[PDB]
């Protein structure tokens, strides 16, 4: 079981679609080996080093916080149906709502859209909010997404540096 990582006063709360098996097995979120998260939020500004999956409970520390849209784990994400998606996307907004961070950066066009019963969906910053809570739609990071680290690095910068201070 992967738990939540979450308290007030966050910058940017990073949700993904649901914990892939290494994920599961250690309780710590993005814990293959191959997903450039960890590496990604480093570069990208958010940690001033780079953390290791049991380290994940520091993320508290740089003001950030995990959740996931599925609890339900499975080898590839897009084993998860659209209909898990929706489910998830209420228990999301309540959550947000709860512990109010800056952003919520949902990891994955296809999450973003069927959580939020959203389409054609751009990257990026989102016009919709949750309260006060910005979103931000940001590329998934496993090392099965074709993305590049240069244009993940990129694109997590992008949030770090819109967010100030």
Known sequence: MVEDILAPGLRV???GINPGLSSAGTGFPFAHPANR???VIYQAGFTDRQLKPQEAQHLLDYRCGVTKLVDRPTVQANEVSKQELHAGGRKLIEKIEDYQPQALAIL???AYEQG???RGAQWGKQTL???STQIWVLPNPSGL???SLEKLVEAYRELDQALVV
């Open 116 to 118: 939020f019963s959203q």
């Open 37 to 39: 998260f960890w590496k």
């Open 13 to 15: 709360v990073f949700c």
């Open 145 to 147: 997404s074709r993305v």
């Open 129 to 131: 909010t949750i309260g």
């Open 108 to 110: 994955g066009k296809q």
